[PDB]
């Protein structure tokens, strides 16, 4: 029951950003997938996790053109309930999977640096595949609820198929959205800090390769923070407004909702930049 | 030496339960599949149960499925058969047989001494026709066997085995896969034939060769033995 | 479509595969070091402190190290050195007291140059153990270092030797961008050499772990 | 002595003249009108996985179905090539294995390497496992090759520049073949099992007589260490692969060099050499990860067996000539047909 | 030393006193052996997949 705010400013400023995303963050993911499938023969647990993250992003970017065509025509989605649902499920599930695999890679890198003799650093490819399938299981179990709600809003002539509404409640949806920037962010920050401290306290930061690895971890953390900060910030801001003012009279949520949409646009930048920060940045790759 | 000493027999009231144990010494028990094969007093052999190497495959006969269970303790080198709900048809001498399966291997090499269990009051058919053949020592004897289904698999192997049971003794392997002679068997024995028609030829029948000859199939799994042909004189 | 015997053979092959995988997992967790030297240069002392190949196994801090000694191999080294391509480190022992004997320090330097710049050990780190500290001190207080190196220009004190000995040994490593030389001064009674080897192996394993991630 | 200055050298000269007295024509001139073999295409029919380290040796069985392989992970695996099943997996006492042989009867296997000991393992045991039947010791260098004469005799070559014929039952060296000035890297047994050729690091291959134990003949021409050797199926010729990126077909009866197989695009040494059943095709494994099939009668590269991801360390052809097995340092055995 | 030189000269004497046939004749012998067994070489002449053990 609320501020769906199908406003026009988004329709005129967002399609350029989404088009830039679809122009850029497609060739890199395609090249990474092609290299993983055929060019690279040696497969390891870290490589498997990287390949799963590439699969997740790639799914997100190939589902992006449906959200593009949505935004192009004044937000006047023409397809049915099932198409809009499945696109919203794929977006939520692939974001969650990308975050989960980012955290898994960070934890792998923390075990490989701080505890080099730990047996988990030498797990077989089958174990990595099982872990990847299991993580996909948690992601789908978290995100299929969207599908369950096969429905959308008829205010804009049944064209306003959106999940992130601003009207009271705190259900399972947006509960994962707040959780994914607190627990995974905390784990990534802890792993990065421990990696840096352990790798510099033992005077391993001497040659250029270790400095490159350290700055690569740091830029991974910065990319995650910059991609997933503003959306959570605007969502907690609108939650504070709800606690103070509320959903009633539905006219004061213009700028905050526009900010929410533009930050959800910035959210794909992680999927766009994943090839250059993870795969293309690897000297072996 | 290789031996399978087993116990657990005796008199059993109908409807009871008993545990038969087979302690193996002298060979790698962990690498051998183990079969329990019973022989009723005077009507030939009959396969009962089988445990694979590593206990990854368990099989039972149609007349004991669910009623029986088979297990193995590799660290203790022991084979267990827990047999419950016993009826009058379960009285027999049970034998503990070892069999290792790989290319060129010889299954059913060694048989246990057998334990008597007496109870107080699809399915390839192997036929041998003639049961008694009296022949003086020194001659040549041909023993025939037939199967309801051809035993020649696409691999080229013909899974038929020829065993001999001497009077008051456990069955001994003579021929495996219809052409190969088991280790320790004199060369006078020779198995031959084609699918559905198999023969075992003894050229110079000397002493200590009288007994009962069994032909067994291994192509389908409910393994079935022949009626048994007994040599006299 | 397989027969009963063929299915059982496949099961046996799968069990063999499981045992092989377990053995390989066990072996991959162990550290392999290749012990090299110029003969009677402290290799026996190093082995004590912790025909063909001599394998010595020792556990330190829940880590299993296997040192392979190739001293008994009098044949051509280049025909079997490629066997030790996956060793985590090469423990090269050089006796500091052999600098004024016959020349022998030059032989050790030649061996180190051949081993370090070998086409197989392009990324295998080398732990350099300079043995006989006390005897080297006694021989350097009396005999100047100029006997071994005519180009030397410095005082004849024990404060010398890492500079112009370890430095010369490390300068033979003309692939410094791919491997590191860990140099340690040791004597008969130190009991710290195992810790130095453990630290070097930890650094090597961290580097290899990272390379595996592609970080790196 | 003074005589060694010239006498032996003089004899050498005579030998060359004798060879010069028999090289009226060459093998290329004789087999110039023979129709070329043409392009040879073999596909990887089977790939054997289970080795976790570089494979250094391999030997086919006389039944052309079972094959034994040795890897640095301390494992000697006996493979059923038809179904890729692992018939046996023997853990070696020493993981530094560089050779393996499979007995013609199929009852025994052999291994050896940097431990200077040839271990003979019994496969047909009543216990149902594989146990060390014998441990022949006496070589003072790494044992690089071993071949079974029968169930009781075995010839081995080591890095101490000597070969040895051992009686397995007694465990002693029945005969010792000496004369090489370098490490002996490979040996091959003649089909009649009366002579054998051993190639060494002195760029020479010597034909020895097993019976009396003397160097019957010596063949030179290679410019580097000889890593592999193999008899022609006829038994009157053999082929040697070396480190100078050149294979060479030598002749026993002519005591000369018959032909040389080399290409300008190849600069890497040969690790293994084998012949087809008819001897028309010569297969050679190279360090460039490939395996080249040459027309043995024309010195033309008939084909390339290029699947492997590392150095092709071992090569073999079945006795019926139906398949060719290649083992490389990438821990994979590949059968080609 | 002297013993090594004597062994070398004796080996050379024993090796140089062997009978050598012409290279053309032995080349023809090898060619004839390759021609006679050409039909029995599965690697040389491709084998039908029906009778190929490694078909898959
Ligand atoms: C057609 C949906 C437009 N709105 C979007 C776009 C992307 C996501 C996303 O999860 O990234 C979510 C929504 N939504 O449903 O509010």
PDB file of N, CA and C in Angstrom, chain D residues 1 3-4 8 11 15 18 21-25 27 31 34 37 45-46 81-82 214-215 218 232-234 251 253-256 258 276-278 280-281 297 320-324 337, chain E residues 1-2 5-9 11-31 33-35 37-38 40-44 47 51-56, unseen atoms left out:
ATOM      1  N   UNK D   1      99.915 -46.104 -22.049  1.00  0.00           N
ATOM      2  CA  UNK D   1     100.990 -46.655 -22.868  1.00  0.00           C
ATOM      3  C   UNK D   1     101.029 -45.983 -24.237  1.00  0.00           C
ATOM      4  N   UNK D   3     100.950 -47.445 -27.208  1.00  0.00           N
ATOM      5  CA  UNK D   3     100.070 -48.066 -28.195  1.00  0.00           C
ATOM      6  C   UNK D   3      98.666 -47.473 -28.147  1.00  0.00           C
ATOM      7  N   UNK D   4      98.155 -47.203 -26.941  1.00  0.00           N
ATOM      8  CA  UNK D   4      96.830 -46.605 -26.809  1.00  0.00           C
ATOM      9  C   UNK D   4      96.740 -45.282 -27.558  1.00  0.00           C
ATOM     10  N   UNK D   8      94.754 -48.467 -30.804  1.00  0.00           N
ATOM     11  CA  UNK D   8      93.302 -48.439 -30.684  1.00  0.00           C
ATOM     12  C   UNK D   8      92.702 -47.460 -31.683  1.00  0.00           C
ATOM     13  N   UNK D  11      92.758 -48.889 -35.021  1.00  0.00           N
ATOM     14  CA  UNK D  11      91.662 -49.840 -35.153  1.00  0.00           C
ATOM     15  C   UNK D  11      90.360 -49.113 -35.446  1.00  0.00           C
ATOM     16  N   UNK D  15      87.744 -49.606 -38.548  1.00  0.00           N
ATOM     17  CA  UNK D  15      86.308 -49.829 -38.416  1.00  0.00           C
ATOM     18  C   UNK D  15      85.551 -48.896 -39.348  1.00  0.00           C
ATOM     19  N   UNK D  18      85.791 -50.047 -42.809  1.00  0.00           N
ATOM     20  CA  UNK D  18      84.894 -51.173 -43.026  1.00  0.00           C
ATOM     21  C   UNK D  18      83.474 -50.686 -43.260  1.00  0.00           C
ATOM     22  N   UNK D  21      83.222 -49.272 -46.481  1.00  0.00           N
ATOM     23  CA  UNK D  21      83.241 -50.303 -47.506  1.00  0.00           C
ATOM     24  C   UNK D  21      81.868 -50.906 -47.767  1.00  0.00           C
ATOM     25  N   UNK D  22      80.876 -50.632 -46.918  1.00  0.00           N
ATOM     26  CA  UNK D  22      79.559 -51.231 -47.078  1.00  0.00           C
ATOM     27  C   UNK D  22      78.462 -50.228 -47.402  1.00  0.00           C
ATOM     28  N   UNK D  23      78.728 -48.929 -47.287  1.00  0.00           N
ATOM     29  CA  UNK D  23      77.716 -47.906 -47.548  1.00  0.00           C
ATOM     30  C   UNK D  23      77.693 -47.532 -49.032  1.00  0.00           C
ATOM     31  N   UNK D  24      77.437 -48.540 -49.869  1.00  0.00           N
ATOM     32  CA  UNK D  24      77.317 -48.295 -51.302  1.00  0.00           C
ATOM     33  C   UNK D  24      76.108 -47.421 -51.613  1.00  0.00           C
ATOM     34  N   UNK D  25      74.978 -47.693 -50.966  1.00  0.00           N
ATOM     35  CA  UNK D  25      73.755 -46.924 -51.135  1.00  0.00           C
ATOM     36  C   UNK D  25      73.196 -46.581 -49.759  1.00  0.00           C
ATOM     37  N   UNK D  27      69.479 -45.834 -47.281  1.00  0.00           N
ATOM     38  CA  UNK D  27      68.110 -46.311 -47.118  1.00  0.00           C
ATOM     39  C   UNK D  27      67.122 -45.458 -47.904  1.00  0.00           C
ATOM     40  N   UNK D  31      64.503 -46.990 -50.587  1.00  0.00           N
ATOM     41  CA  UNK D  31      63.078 -46.719 -50.397  1.00  0.00           C
ATOM     42  C   UNK D  31      62.697 -45.325 -50.887  1.00  0.00           C
ATOM     43  N   UNK D  34      59.093 -46.318 -52.869  1.00  0.00           N
ATOM     44  CA  UNK D  34      58.018 -46.843 -52.039  1.00  0.00           C
ATOM     45  C   UNK D  34      56.948 -45.778 -51.850  1.00  0.00           C
ATOM     46  N   UNK D  37      53.558 -43.330 -46.657  1.00  0.00           N
ATOM     47  CA  UNK D  37      52.535 -43.764 -45.710  1.00  0.00           C
ATOM     48  C   UNK D  37      51.338 -42.824 -45.752  1.00  0.00           C
ATOM     49  N   UNK D  45      41.719 -42.691 -27.642  1.00  0.00           N
ATOM     50  CA  UNK D  45      40.612 -43.592 -27.347  1.00  0.00           C
ATOM     51  C   UNK D  45      40.360 -43.689 -25.847  1.00  0.00           C
ATOM     52  N   UNK D  46      41.421 -43.798 -25.052  1.00  0.00           N
ATOM     53  CA  UNK D  46      41.303 -43.915 -23.608  1.00  0.00           C
ATOM     54  C   UNK D  46      42.261 -42.949 -22.929  1.00  0.00           C
ATOM     55  N   UNK D  81      43.506 -51.584 -19.856  1.00  0.00           N
ATOM     56  CA  UNK D  81      43.389 -50.515 -20.843  1.00  0.00           C
ATOM     57  C   UNK D  81      42.038 -50.518 -21.545  1.00  0.00           C
ATOM     58  N   UNK D  82      41.420 -51.691 -21.708  1.00  0.00           N
ATOM     59  CA  UNK D  82      40.153 -51.761 -22.431  1.00  0.00           C
ATOM     60  C   UNK D  82      39.051 -51.005 -21.700  1.00  0.00           C
ATOM     61  N   UNK D 214      79.338 -60.022 -23.345  1.00  0.00           N
ATOM     62  CA  UNK D 214      80.363 -59.159 -23.912  1.00  0.00           C
ATOM     63  C   UNK D 214      79.727 -58.196 -24.902  1.00  0.00           C
ATOM     64  N   UNK D 215      80.380 -57.053 -25.095  1.00  0.00           N
ATOM     65  CA  UNK D 215      79.888 -56.028 -26.012  1.00  0.00           C
ATOM     66  C   UNK D 215      80.123 -56.495 -27.441  1.00  0.00           C
ATOM     67  N   UNK D 218      79.280 -51.768 -31.179  1.00  0.00           N
ATOM     68  CA  UNK D 218      79.128 -50.400 -30.700  1.00  0.00           C
ATOM     69  C   UNK D 218      78.711 -49.501 -31.854  1.00  0.00           C
ATOM     70  N   UNK D 232      64.013 -52.928 -33.894  1.00  0.00           N
ATOM     71  CA  UNK D 232      63.091 -53.164 -34.988  1.00  0.00           C
ATOM     72  C   UNK D 232      62.387 -54.503 -34.770  1.00  0.00           C
ATOM     73  N   UNK D 233      61.135 -54.638 -35.212  1.00  0.00           N
ATOM     74  CA  UNK D 233      60.443 -55.927 -35.043  1.00  0.00           C
ATOM     75  C   UNK D 233      61.174 -57.093 -35.682  1.00  0.00           C
ATOM     76  N   UNK D 234      61.919 -56.854 -36.763  1.00  0.00           N
ATOM     77  CA  UNK D 234      62.726 -57.913 -37.359  1.00  0.00           C
ATOM     78  C   UNK D 234      63.800 -58.391 -36.390  1.00  0.00           C
ATOM     79  N   UNK D 251      71.709 -50.162 -37.849  1.00  0.00           N
ATOM     80  CA  UNK D 251      71.606 -51.497 -38.421  1.00  0.00           C
ATOM     81  C   UNK D 251      72.595 -52.429 -37.739  1.00  0.00           C
ATOM     82  N   UNK D 253      73.307 -55.698 -38.735  1.00  0.00           N
ATOM     83  CA  UNK D 253      74.085 -56.489 -39.684  1.00  0.00           C
ATOM     84  C   UNK D 253      75.077 -55.625 -40.451  1.00  0.00           C
ATOM     85  N   UNK D 254      74.667 -54.423 -40.855  1.00  0.00           N
ATOM     86  CA  UNK D 254      75.576 -53.528 -41.559  1.00  0.00           C
ATOM     87  C   UNK D 254      76.511 -52.785 -40.616  1.00  0.00           C
ATOM     88  N   UNK D 255      76.198 -52.755 -39.318  1.00  0.00           N
ATOM     89  CA  UNK D 255      77.027 -52.087 -38.314  1.00  0.00           C
ATOM     90  C   UNK D 255      77.264 -50.622 -38.677  1.00  0.00           C
ATOM     91  N   UNK D 256      76.219 -49.959 -39.164  1.00  0.00           N
ATOM     92  CA  UNK D 256      76.337 -48.591 -39.648  1.00  0.00           C
ATOM     93  C   UNK D 256      75.130 -47.789 -39.183  1.00  0.00           C
ATOM     94  N   UNK D 258      71.751 -46.322 -40.581  1.00  0.00           N
ATOM     95  CA  UNK D 258      70.813 -46.477 -41.686  1.00  0.00           C
ATOM     96  C   UNK D 258      70.105 -45.170 -42.018  1.00  0.00           C
ATOM     97  N   UNK D 276      56.109 -49.592 -34.519  1.00  0.00           N
ATOM     98  CA  UNK D 276      54.830 -50.237 -34.760  1.00  0.00           C
ATOM     99  C   UNK D 276      55.043 -51.737 -34.962  1.00  0.00           C
ATOM    100  N   UNK D 277      53.944 -52.465 -35.173  1.00  0.00           N
ATOM    101  CA  UNK D 277      54.044 -53.914 -35.321  1.00  0.00           C
ATOM    102  C   UNK D 277      54.830 -54.293 -36.570  1.00  0.00           C
ATOM    103  N   UNK D 278      54.586 -53.602 -37.683  1.00  0.00           N
ATOM    104  CA  UNK D 278      55.292 -53.894 -38.923  1.00  0.00           C
ATOM    105  C   UNK D 278      56.627 -53.173 -39.033  1.00  0.00           C
ATOM    106  N   UNK D 280      57.024 -50.090 -39.887  1.00  0.00           N
ATOM    107  CA  UNK D 280      56.976 -49.003 -40.857  1.00  0.00           C
ATOM    108  C   UNK D 280      56.877 -47.645 -40.176  1.00  0.00           C
ATOM    109  N   UNK D 281      56.199 -47.571 -39.037  1.00  0.00           N
ATOM    110  CA  UNK D 281      56.022 -46.327 -38.301  1.00  0.00           C
ATOM    111  C   UNK D 281      56.921 -46.331 -37.075  1.00  0.00           C
ATOM    112  N   UNK D 297      60.908 -45.772 -43.093  1.00  0.00           N
ATOM    113  CA  UNK D 297      61.587 -46.064 -44.347  1.00  0.00           C
ATOM    114  C   UNK D 297      61.806 -44.830 -45.213  1.00  0.00           C
ATOM    115  N   UNK D 320      50.274 -56.710 -30.363  1.00  0.00           N
ATOM    116  CA  UNK D 320      49.449 -56.878 -31.552  1.00  0.00           C
ATOM    117  C   UNK D 320      49.388 -55.617 -32.403  1.00  0.00           C
ATOM    118  N   UNK D 321      50.040 -54.537 -31.978  1.00  0.00           N
ATOM    119  CA  UNK D 321      50.083 -53.317 -32.756  1.00  0.00           C
ATOM    120  C   UNK D 321      48.777 -52.567 -32.846  1.00  0.00           C
ATOM    121  N   UNK D 322      47.839 -52.819 -31.935  1.00  0.00           N
ATOM    122  CA  UNK D 322      46.518 -52.217 -32.037  1.00  0.00           C
ATOM    123  C   UNK D 322      46.446 -50.824 -31.425  1.00  0.00           C
ATOM    124  N   UNK D 323      47.332 -50.492 -30.488  1.00  0.00           N
ATOM    125  CA  UNK D 323      47.237 -49.215 -29.798  1.00  0.00           C
ATOM    126  C   UNK D 323      48.621 -48.757 -29.370  1.00  0.00           C
ATOM    127  N   UNK D 324      48.730 -47.458 -29.099  1.00  0.00           N
ATOM    128  CA  UNK D 324      49.967 -46.842 -28.631  1.00  0.00           C
ATOM    129  C   UNK D 324      49.657 -46.077 -27.355  1.00  0.00           C
ATOM    130  N   UNK D 337      44.808 -44.821 -31.173  1.00  0.00           N
ATOM    131  CA  UNK D 337      44.524 -45.850 -32.162  1.00  0.00           C
ATOM    132  C   UNK D 337      44.171 -45.223 -33.507  1.00  0.00           C
TER     133      UNK D 337
ATOM    134  N   UNK E   1      94.323 -47.318 -16.613  1.00  0.00           N
ATOM    135  CA  UNK E   1      95.749 -47.272 -16.912  1.00  0.00           C
ATOM    136  C   UNK E   1      96.102 -48.230 -18.044  1.00  0.00           C
ATOM    137  N   UNK E   2      97.150 -49.031 -17.833  1.00  0.00           N
ATOM    138  CA  UNK E   2      97.564 -49.999 -18.845  1.00  0.00           C
ATOM    139  C   UNK E   2      96.487 -51.058 -19.040  1.00  0.00           C
ATOM    140  N   UNK E   5      93.688 -49.640 -21.173  1.00  0.00           N
ATOM    141  CA  UNK E   5      94.073 -49.579 -22.579  1.00  0.00           C
ATOM    142  C   UNK E   5      94.060 -50.962 -23.217  1.00  0.00           C
ATOM    143  N   UNK E   6      94.546 -51.974 -22.494  1.00  0.00           N
ATOM    144  CA  UNK E   6      94.520 -53.335 -23.020  1.00  0.00           C
ATOM    145  C   UNK E   6      93.091 -53.814 -23.238  1.00  0.00           C
ATOM    146  N   UNK E   7      92.200 -53.529 -22.286  1.00  0.00           N
ATOM    147  CA  UNK E   7      90.799 -53.899 -22.452  1.00  0.00           C
ATOM    148  C   UNK E   7      90.187 -53.200 -23.658  1.00  0.00           C
ATOM    149  N   UNK E   8      90.483 -51.910 -23.830  1.00  0.00           N
ATOM    150  CA  UNK E   8      89.925 -51.164 -24.953  1.00  0.00           C
ATOM    151  C   UNK E   8      90.421 -51.711 -26.286  1.00  0.00           C
ATOM    152  N   UNK E   9      91.722 -51.990 -26.394  1.00  0.00           N
ATOM    153  CA  UNK E   9      92.252 -52.484 -27.661  1.00  0.00           C
ATOM    154  C   UNK E   9      91.747 -53.895 -27.942  1.00  0.00           C
ATOM    155  N   UNK E  11      88.788 -55.074 -26.977  1.00  0.00           N
ATOM    156  CA  UNK E  11      87.405 -54.901 -27.406  1.00  0.00           C
ATOM    157  C   UNK E  11      87.334 -54.406 -28.844  1.00  0.00           C
ATOM    158  N   UNK E  12      88.205 -53.465 -29.212  1.00  0.00           N
ATOM    159  CA  UNK E  12      88.215 -52.966 -30.584  1.00  0.00           C
ATOM    160  C   UNK E  12      88.635 -54.053 -31.567  1.00  0.00           C
ATOM    161  N   UNK E  13      89.619 -54.876 -31.193  1.00  0.00           N
ATOM    162  CA  UNK E  13      90.023 -55.988 -32.046  1.00  0.00           C
ATOM    163  C   UNK E  13      88.877 -56.971 -32.246  1.00  0.00           C
ATOM    164  N   UNK E  14      88.150 -57.285 -31.173  1.00  0.00           N
ATOM    165  CA  UNK E  14      87.047 -58.234 -31.286  1.00  0.00           C
ATOM    166  C   UNK E  14      85.892 -57.645 -32.088  1.00  0.00           C
ATOM    167  N   UNK E  15      85.683 -56.331 -31.987  1.00  0.00           N
ATOM    168  CA  UNK E  15      84.578 -55.700 -32.702  1.00  0.00           C
ATOM    169  C   UNK E  15      84.885 -55.547 -34.187  1.00  0.00           C
ATOM    170  N   UNK E  16      86.131 -55.219 -34.529  1.00  0.00           N
ATOM    171  CA  UNK E  16      86.496 -54.948 -35.914  1.00  0.00           C
ATOM    172  C   UNK E  16      86.593 -56.204 -36.769  1.00  0.00           C
ATOM    173  N   UNK E  17      86.540 -57.392 -36.169  1.00  0.00           N
ATOM    174  CA  UNK E  17      86.671 -58.648 -36.898  1.00  0.00           C
ATOM    175  C   UNK E  17      85.325 -59.317 -37.152  1.00  0.00           C
ATOM    176  N   UNK E  18      84.275 -58.531 -37.369  1.00  0.00           N
ATOM    177  CA  UNK E  18      82.948 -59.062 -37.640  1.00  0.00           C
ATOM    178  C   UNK E  18      82.644 -58.897 -39.122  1.00  0.00           C
ATOM    179  N   UNK E  19      81.700 -59.702 -39.602  1.00  0.00           N
ATOM    180  CA  UNK E  19      81.297 -59.675 -41.000  1.00  0.00           C
ATOM    181  C   UNK E  19      80.186 -58.652 -41.197  1.00  0.00           C
ATOM    182  N   UNK E  20      80.389 -57.738 -42.139  1.00  0.00           N
ATOM    183  CA  UNK E  20      79.432 -56.684 -42.441  1.00  0.00           C
ATOM    184  C   UNK E  20      78.887 -56.883 -43.848  1.00  0.00           C
ATOM    185  N   UNK E  21      77.566 -56.875 -43.975  1.00  0.00           N
ATOM    186  CA  UNK E  21      76.924 -56.966 -45.275  1.00  0.00           C
ATOM    187  C   UNK E  21      76.742 -55.563 -45.834  1.00  0.00           C
ATOM    188  N   UNK E  22      76.485 -55.486 -47.137  1.00  0.00           N
ATOM    189  CA  UNK E  22      76.279 -54.200 -47.782  1.00  0.00           C
ATOM    190  C   UNK E  22      75.027 -53.521 -47.237  1.00  0.00           C
ATOM    191  N   UNK E  23      75.078 -52.189 -47.172  1.00  0.00           N
ATOM    192  CA  UNK E  23      73.953 -51.425 -46.641  1.00  0.00           C
ATOM    193  C   UNK E  23      72.727 -51.586 -47.526  1.00  0.00           C
ATOM    194  N   UNK E  24      72.924 -51.690 -48.843  1.00  0.00           N
ATOM    195  CA  UNK E  24      71.793 -51.850 -49.751  1.00  0.00           C
ATOM    196  C   UNK E  24      71.030 -53.141 -49.474  1.00  0.00           C
ATOM    197  N   UNK E  25      71.748 -54.241 -49.237  1.00  0.00           N
ATOM    198  CA  UNK E  25      71.082 -55.520 -49.001  1.00  0.00           C
ATOM    199  C   UNK E  25      70.257 -55.494 -47.720  1.00  0.00           C
ATOM    200  N   UNK E  26      70.814 -54.945 -46.641  1.00  0.00           N
ATOM    201  CA  UNK E  26      70.072 -54.886 -45.387  1.00  0.00           C
ATOM    202  C   UNK E  26      68.922 -53.891 -45.460  1.00  0.00           C
ATOM    203  N   UNK E  27      69.099 -52.795 -46.201  1.00  0.00           N
ATOM    204  CA  UNK E  27      67.995 -51.874 -46.439  1.00  0.00           C
ATOM    205  C   UNK E  27      66.865 -52.564 -47.191  1.00  0.00           C
ATOM    206  N   UNK E  28      67.210 -53.370 -48.197  1.00  0.00           N
ATOM    207  CA  UNK E  28      66.200 -54.137 -48.914  1.00  0.00           C
ATOM    208  C   UNK E  28      65.521 -55.145 -47.997  1.00  0.00           C
ATOM    209  N   UNK E  29      66.282 -55.749 -47.082  1.00  0.00           N
ATOM    210  CA  UNK E  29      65.690 -56.683 -46.129  1.00  0.00           C
ATOM    211  C   UNK E  29      64.685 -55.984 -45.219  1.00  0.00           C
ATOM    212  N   UNK E  30      65.042 -54.804 -44.708  1.00  0.00           N
ATOM    213  CA  UNK E  30      64.111 -54.043 -43.877  1.00  0.00           C
ATOM    214  C   UNK E  30      62.875 -53.632 -44.668  1.00  0.00           C
ATOM    215  N   UNK E  31      63.068 -53.207 -45.918  1.00  0.00           N
ATOM    216  CA  UNK E  31      61.939 -52.832 -46.763  1.00  0.00           C
ATOM    217  C   UNK E  31      61.017 -54.020 -47.009  1.00  0.00           C
ATOM    218  N   UNK E  33      60.675 -56.659 -45.053  1.00  0.00           N
ATOM    219  CA  UNK E  33      59.978 -56.959 -43.807  1.00  0.00           C
ATOM    220  C   UNK E  33      58.816 -56.001 -43.583  1.00  0.00           C
ATOM    221  N   UNK E  34      59.019 -54.712 -43.864  1.00  0.00           N
ATOM    222  CA  UNK E  34      57.933 -53.750 -43.713  1.00  0.00           C
ATOM    223  C   UNK E  34      56.807 -54.011 -44.707  1.00  0.00           C
ATOM    224  N   UNK E  35      57.142 -54.459 -45.918  1.00  0.00           N
ATOM    225  CA  UNK E  35      56.114 -54.708 -46.924  1.00  0.00           C
ATOM    226  C   UNK E  35      55.322 -55.972 -46.612  1.00  0.00           C
ATOM    227  N   UNK E  37      54.623 -57.397 -43.712  1.00  0.00           N
ATOM    228  CA  UNK E  37      53.756 -57.246 -42.553  1.00  0.00           C
ATOM    229  C   UNK E  37      52.925 -55.970 -42.605  1.00  0.00           C
ATOM    230  N   UNK E  38      52.818 -55.345 -43.780  1.00  0.00           N
ATOM    231  CA  UNK E  38      52.050 -54.109 -43.895  1.00  0.00           C
ATOM    232  C   UNK E  38      50.576 -54.339 -43.587  1.00  0.00           C
ATOM    233  N   UNK E  40      49.287 -56.394 -41.579  1.00  0.00           N
ATOM    234  CA  UNK E  40      49.078 -56.808 -40.199  1.00  0.00           C
ATOM    235  C   UNK E  40      49.388 -55.698 -39.199  1.00  0.00           C
ATOM    236  N   UNK E  41      49.455 -54.448 -39.655  1.00  0.00           N
ATOM    237  CA  UNK E  41      49.770 -53.323 -38.781  1.00  0.00           C
ATOM    238  C   UNK E  41      48.527 -52.460 -38.606  1.00  0.00           C
ATOM    239  N   UNK E  42      47.816 -52.570 -37.482  1.00  0.00           N
ATOM    240  CA  UNK E  42      46.629 -51.722 -37.279  1.00  0.00           C
ATOM    241  C   UNK E  42      46.932 -50.235 -37.274  1.00  0.00           C
ATOM    242  N   UNK E  43      48.107 -49.829 -36.794  1.00  0.00           N
ATOM    243  CA  UNK E  43      48.439 -48.408 -36.771  1.00  0.00           C
ATOM    244  C   UNK E  43      48.698 -47.876 -38.174  1.00  0.00           C
ATOM    245  N   UNK E  44      49.314 -48.688 -39.034  1.00  0.00           N
ATOM    246  CA  UNK E  44      49.604 -48.248 -40.393  1.00  0.00           C
ATOM    247  C   UNK E  44      48.330 -48.165 -41.223  1.00  0.00           C
ATOM    248  N   UNK E  47      42.068 -49.652 -38.852  1.00  0.00           N
ATOM    249  CA  UNK E  47      41.283 -50.856 -38.594  1.00  0.00           C
ATOM    250  C   UNK E  47      39.808 -50.475 -38.533  1.00  0.00           C
ATOM    251  N   UNK E  51      36.061 -54.240 -35.250  1.00  0.00           N
ATOM    252  CA  UNK E  51      37.062 -55.085 -34.611  1.00  0.00           C
ATOM    253  C   UNK E  51      38.122 -54.264 -33.879  1.00  0.00           C
ATOM    254  N   UNK E  52      37.776 -53.040 -33.480  1.00  0.00           N
ATOM    255  CA  UNK E  52      38.697 -52.184 -32.752  1.00  0.00           C
ATOM    256  C   UNK E  52      38.422 -52.310 -31.263  1.00  0.00           C
ATOM    257  N   UNK E  53      39.339 -52.872 -30.472  1.00  0.00           N
ATOM    258  CA  UNK E  53      39.084 -53.002 -29.029  1.00  0.00           C
ATOM    259  C   UNK E  53      38.892 -51.675 -28.318  1.00  0.00           C
ATOM    260  N   UNK E  54      39.484 -50.597 -28.827  1.00  0.00           N
ATOM    261  CA  UNK E  54      39.397 -49.276 -28.209  1.00  0.00           C
ATOM    262  C   UNK E  54      38.424 -48.366 -28.947  1.00  0.00           C
ATOM    263  N   UNK E  55      37.312 -48.915 -29.427  1.00  0.00           N
ATOM    264  CA  UNK E  55      36.334 -48.146 -30.189  1.00  0.00           C
ATOM    265  C   UNK E  55      35.748 -46.996 -29.370  1.00  0.00           C
ATOM    266  N   UNK E  56      35.497 -47.249 -28.089  1.00  0.00           N
ATOM    267  CA  UNK E  56      34.958 -46.228 -27.196  1.00  0.00           C
TER     268      UNK E  56
END
